[PDB]
């Protein structure tokens, strides 16, 4: 069920010895007291903080500020279990004595394929500055780079307005992103919306992947969408959003 090693984060733990993935309680440097983590750990002493994981449509992801801050959804020692590990956490981990993290995004599709992009030196702001988004480059990777924004050609300026870095947390009942409107809202999900998104995995699960302007009444893409890796009206089957610190690539 949960493993004796604890450390930091768990590449730490993988640095003294475990060798199974499964739940681990880790303790970074400003966190008051430690919490329970889902550890990927591989073959070659890679260890993987996972905060965020889809995969069959289980938990609702239309939650408001504070079950964002806080976490909400299963973990499981088996890893087949939906959540979102909470932002506070999440700020915590990637912040701790400014050492630098990778964000690795790895999607599946409906037919088995299944890509990755990642981004080198991933940050995520205190509560104050509305849990910020920042990032360095993107690393690379087949599912492309979403967060850098994209041309959907709805308007001149599409690209201005899908990219992520430097945006700040949103959910229906906390409006911080740049559109007139609530993104958070209007989609049912909390995210990092601009306005609105170009990369959102927080969205409604469609089951079968494909779906369209008329799957909703309003005709939104609020799917699990990752823009330059499928299209907008493609919702993907499985998401995990992970971390490790930047030299384990
Ligand atoms: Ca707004």
């Known amino acids: 069920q949960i493993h004796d090693i604890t ?6 733990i993988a640095n003294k ?13 400003k966190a008051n007291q430690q919490f329970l983590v889902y ?8 260890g993987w903080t996972v905060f965020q994981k889809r995969l069959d449509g289980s938990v609702d992801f239309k939650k ?55 981004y080198a030196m991933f940050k995520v702001g205190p509560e104050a500055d ?8 993107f690393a690379g ?25 430097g945006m700040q947390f949103s959910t229906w009942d906390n409006d911080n992103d740049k559109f007139e409107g609530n993104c958070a809202e209007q989609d049912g999900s909390g995210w990092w919306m601009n306005k609105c998104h170009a990369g959102h995995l927080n969205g409604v699960y469609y089951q079968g992947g494909t779906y369209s302007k008329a799957s909703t009444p309003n005709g939104y893409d609020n799917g699990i969408i990752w823009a330059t890796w499928k ?17 384990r690539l």
Request: aromatic fraction near 16%; charged fraction near 25%.
């Open 130 to 137: 509305k849990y910020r988004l920042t990032y360095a480059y």
């Open 17 to 29: 010895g475990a060798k199974q993935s499964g739940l681990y309680f880790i303790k970074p440097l």
């Open 64 to 118: 408001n500020w504070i079950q964002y801050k806080e976490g909400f959804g299963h973990l499981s020692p088996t890893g087949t279990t939906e959540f979102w590990l909470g932002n506070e956490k999440i700020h915590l981990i990637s912040t701790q004595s400014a050492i630098p993290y990778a964000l690795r995004v790895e999607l599946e599709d409906w037919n088995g394929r299944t890509s990755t992009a990642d």
């Open 7 to 12: 450390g930091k984060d768990c590449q730490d």
């Open 141 to 165: 990777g087949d599912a492309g780079d979403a967060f850098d924004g994209f041309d959907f050609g709805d308007d001149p300026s599409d690209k201005f307005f899908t990219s992520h870095n």
């Open 39 to 46: 550890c990927e750990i591989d073959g070659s002493g890679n």
């Open 231 to 247: 299209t907008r009206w493609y919702s993907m089957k499985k998401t995990t959003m992970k971390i490790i610190p930047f030299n």
